[PDB]
Design a protein around this ligand. Structure first.
Ligand SMILES: O=c1ccn([C@H]2C[C@H](O)[C@@H](COP(=O)(O)NP(=O)(O)OP(=O)(O)O)O2)c(=O)[nH]1
Ligand SMILES: [Cl-]
Ligand SMILES: [Cl-]
Ligand SMILES: [Cl-]
Ligand SMILES: [Cl-]
Ligand SMILES: [Mg+2]
Ligand SMILES: [Mg+2]
Ligand code: NA
Ligand code: NA
Length: 326
DNA sequence: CCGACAGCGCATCAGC
DNA sequence: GCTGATGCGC
DNA sequence: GTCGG
């Protein structure tokens, strides 16, 4: 946290561009800058110093000098005072309400938690669940609870079929002391890149979890991706645990490594790694790594027997999950 | 300068 | 109904 | 907003 003030500033700017300006590239520019500065092992003393880092240009350098000299940024000061911006930024905090819907609601005069609650009939299913658990979704998940959550999911999945393999990825797998949610990667021998010998593979698991009352709500659900809400059981006379966001992503078993790589992140790490891959002549997704032809068209999937193999293809030294938190 | 910026699942919609 | 675009999120 | 060619 040597540069917490600067990274917070850039993150706020990133959120402004994404949520209010709807300028996704500026949003990513700011996040990339915050990221590289977040790992820079020195307390930054000037914008010039910061500008030496990749992702930090002239504009950000200037902002860093202003922040260093005054402890704040006029641009953000004004943004915070702008009611429209503030309202739109707030609404996007509800799961399911993005930049477009927030601006629409604000036009309709809906700009507060109270307003949303009085207009629940104007929200789609996802948004409705997001509003319902607004508070809870704001709370972090102590790793201690993530461990209890992992135990339940793995045991319940085992009960459905001993051949399933559930792996908790995301921030949990990177060793984080607390997580925003639980990301579960799921595989079964019946579902491979070559065939699906068993339908409802994901359904059966979600069903078992609801039956035991672990999964309490559903945000979205397809044949390979489920996103919903879950809750740990509490004891007698004990206050209940906050509801938590959970996702179960079913991936073809023979494509496990590309899958766990993708699901372990971080998101910015994946962006950087996939970008590097392109420069090296490859393309990486959660299923495979393919070479790029002289035309740019992805070729056939290359053999993969470990996460490290993927790193080898792009000439990157292997990085443990804990060191991928960019 | 200037095009590129990672890659994709599910929900909802318009047009047919 | 379908396909394709778009919103939203991982 | 940043940057490689
Ligand atoms: O833009 C994205 C978002 C997520 N992901 C991948 C990497 C990330 O680690 C994983 C899980 O997504 P989350 O949004 O759950 N983030 P993470 O688990 O890293 O952190 P936390 O949940 O604690 O915020 O999905 C991407 O590749 N791109
Ligand atoms: Cl943009
Ligand atoms: Cl500020
Ligand atoms: Cl693929
Ligand atoms: Cl690790
Ligand atoms: Mg997560
Ligand atoms: Mg997640
Ligand atoms: Na730079
Ligand atoms: Na949102």
């Amino acid at each position: 946290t040597l540069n917490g003030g600067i990274t917070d500033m850039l993150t706020e700017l990133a959120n402004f561009e994404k949520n209010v300006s709807q300028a996704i590239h500026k949003y990513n520019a700011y996040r990339k800058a915050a990221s590289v500065i977040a790992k820079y092992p020195h307390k930054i003393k000037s914008g010039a110093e910061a500008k030496k880092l990749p992702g930090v240009g002239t504009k950000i350098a200037e902002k860093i000098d202003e922040f260093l000299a005054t402890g704040k940024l006029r641009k953000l000061e004004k943004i915070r005072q702008d009611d429209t911006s503030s309202s739109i930024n707030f609404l996007t905090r509800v799961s399911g309400i993005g930049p477009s819907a927030a601006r629409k609601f604000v036009d309709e005069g809906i700009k507060t938690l109270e307003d949303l609650r009085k207009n629940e009939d104007k929200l789609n299913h996802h948004q409705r669940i997001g509003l319902k658990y607004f508070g809870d979704f704001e709370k972090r998940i102590p790793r201690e609870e993530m461990l209890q959550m992992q135990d339940i999911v793995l045991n319940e999945v085992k009960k459905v079929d001993s051949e399933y393999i559930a792996t908790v990825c995301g921030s949990f797998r990177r060793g984080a002391e607390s997580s925003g949610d639980m990301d579960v990667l799921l595989t079964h021998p019946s579902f491979t890149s070559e065939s699906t010998k068993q339908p409802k593979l994901l359904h059966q698991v979600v069903e078992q979890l609801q039956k035991v009352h672990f999964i309490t709500d559903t945000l979205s659900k397809g044949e390979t991706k489920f996103m919903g809400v879950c809750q740990l059981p509490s004891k007698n006379d004990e206050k209940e645990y906050p509801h938590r966001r959970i996702e179960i992503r079913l991936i073809p078993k023979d494509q496990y490594y590309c899958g766990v790589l993708y699901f372990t992140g971080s998101d910015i790490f994946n962006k950087n790694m996939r970008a590097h891959a392109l420069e090296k002549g490859f393309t990486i997704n959660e299923y495979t790594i393919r070479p790029l032809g002289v035309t740019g068209v992805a070729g056939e999937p290359l053999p993969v027997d470990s996460e490290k193999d993927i790193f080898d293809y792009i000439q990157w030294k292997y990085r443990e999950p804990k060191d991928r938190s960019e």
